Design brief:
With 418 residues, the chain is of the alpha+beta class. It is built from 15 helices and 15 strands. The longest helix is centred in the middle third of the chain and has 20 residues, at 228-247. The protein is elongated, with a radius of gyration of 23 Å. The two termini are 41 Å apart. The structure holds open form - penicillin G and chloride ion (2 copies). It is an enzyme of class 2 (transferase). It comes from Enterococcus faecalis (Streptococcus faecalis).
């Protein structure tokens, strides 16, 4: 039986079969014609699609080829058939978006998740660096394989499913929670002097620090300037109960119906912060938050659905599933409108991607890990609400920011997905 195909949303192949003339024990391509598993996108979708391998003795313990990793293994039952050819599985992936999202990294460690925010379609799930899935499935030498395993940037890992601290992009949720709680007034002008702030001397040598000097600061200025002090103060103003009440309406601790293994997102290590510092850190995306890029794109989907959360989906014919009224419609549109300044204001961090013919909201972020720094970029299509991007660059202190590489992807999406 011929193994079933994995195709993208347009029917283009992602995991298919192709006949080669191999130079009987086939080694490499030239003598005998054999059918081999082929991946047209190669490393661009290696971690997602995975690769196949020969059935081993340990596999036959839980009663041809079998999917070893990725969707080849998760869908191995439906794909392998029975010798009835295997079934064809059509994904939400867009091959053009998948290849563009992978090209921007250029061996930099990071990930990119592009979604249809109103339907949950995962248009692209990219992890960098990557590996050749055709060689892993049909013949890789110990030299090339050891180069993958000794790569400290870990190309085999699926970074879009790994949990990270979200960074300053998380301020969009903290601000929306503050709006619905009634403690955050969008027009209130907060006096903030200097670059560091603590509640009082009980914080010791720790301060919430910002990068830009500005006063007074309202909600929109705090988002565009990415002011940590404003959001640390607003988080302490609302309190842990009001803060967690809004956070708990998101998908924290919730396993998703995605064929991708993923630890659920968490707010902190325990049910209580037991620290004003930890409560304030969580307000601007640090602390003990662990959210994967797929989970981040899911949480941030509320700003393009009038406060409704749209769950992600990878299989095209799967019905859209939502979580209603995670935040209010007024809070979602207030935050999304304020994020237009990140792209449209000449001093905004995403002004490099400014397009006078397209409405793009955005929010950047740099997380400090116990150190190293990761860069994040969230963009929101506000012209038609047809795409959402969650882009991350690991070790941004050496690899640069996500904003510095993501413009060709955003330009591609504004002309294609629109
Ligand atoms: C949000 O993530 C904020 N980041 C920090 O407070 C930590 C940090 C890391 C490196 C340098 C300075 C501060 C602010 N948002 C990011 C961002 O948008 O890239 C800033 C670096 C502007 S700070
Ligand atoms: Cl799915
Ligand atoms: Cl920003």
């Amino acid at each position: 039986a011929k193994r079933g195909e994995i195709v993208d949303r347009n029917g283009s192949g992602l995991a298919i079969n192709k006949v080669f003339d191999e130079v009987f024990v086939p080694i490499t391509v030239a003598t005998k014609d054999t059918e081999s598993r082929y991946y047209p996108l190669g490393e661009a979708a290696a971690q997602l699609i995975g690769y196949t391998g020969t059935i081993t003795a340990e596999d036959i313990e839980k009663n041809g080829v079998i999917g070893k990793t990725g969707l080849e293994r998760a869908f191995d039952k439906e794909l392998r058939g029975q010798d009835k050819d295997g079934q064809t599985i059509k994904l939400t992936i867009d091959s053009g978006v998948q290849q563009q999202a992978f090209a921007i990294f250029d061996k930099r460690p990071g990930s990119a998740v592009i979604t249809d925010p109103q339907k949950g379609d995962l248009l692209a799930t990219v992890s960098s660096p990557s590996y050749d899935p055709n060689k892993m499935a049909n013949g890789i030498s110990q030299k090339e394989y050891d180069a993958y395993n000794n790569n400290k940037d870990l190309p085999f890992t699926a970074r879009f499913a790994t949990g990270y601290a979200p960074g300053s992009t998380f301020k969009t949720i903290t601000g929306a929670i503050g709006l619905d709680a009634g403690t955050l007034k969008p027009d209130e002008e907060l006096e903030i002097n200097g670059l560091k702030w603590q509640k009082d001397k009980s914080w010791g040598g720790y301060f919430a620090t910002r990068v830009k000097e500005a006063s007074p600061v309202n909600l929109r200025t705090a988002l565009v300037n990415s002011d940590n002090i404003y959001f640390a103060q607003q988080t302490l103003r609302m309190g842990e109960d009001k803060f967690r009440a809004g956070l708990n309406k998101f998908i924290f601790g919730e396993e998703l119906d995605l064929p991708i293994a993923m630890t659920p997102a968490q707010i902190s290590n325990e049910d209580k912060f037991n620290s004003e510092i930890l409560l304030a850190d969580t307000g601007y995306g640090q602390g003990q938050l662990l959210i994967s890029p797929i989970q981040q794109a899911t949480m941030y989907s509320v700003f393009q659905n009038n406060g409704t959360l749209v769950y992600p989906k990878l299989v095209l014919d799967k019905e859209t599933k939502k979580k209603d009224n995670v935040i209010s419609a007024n809070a979602a549109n207030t935050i999304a409108t304020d994020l237009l300044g990140s792209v449209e204001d000449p001093s905004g961090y995403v002004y490099n991607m400014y397009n006078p013919n397209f409405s793009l909201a955005a929010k950047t972020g740099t997380a400090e890990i116990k150190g190293k720094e990761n860069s994040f970029l969230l963009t929101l299509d506000r012209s038609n609400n047809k795409f959402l991007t969650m882009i991350m660059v690991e070790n941004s202190g050496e690899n640069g920011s996500a904003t510095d590489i993501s413009k060709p992807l955003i330009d591609y999406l504004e002309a294609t997905i629109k």
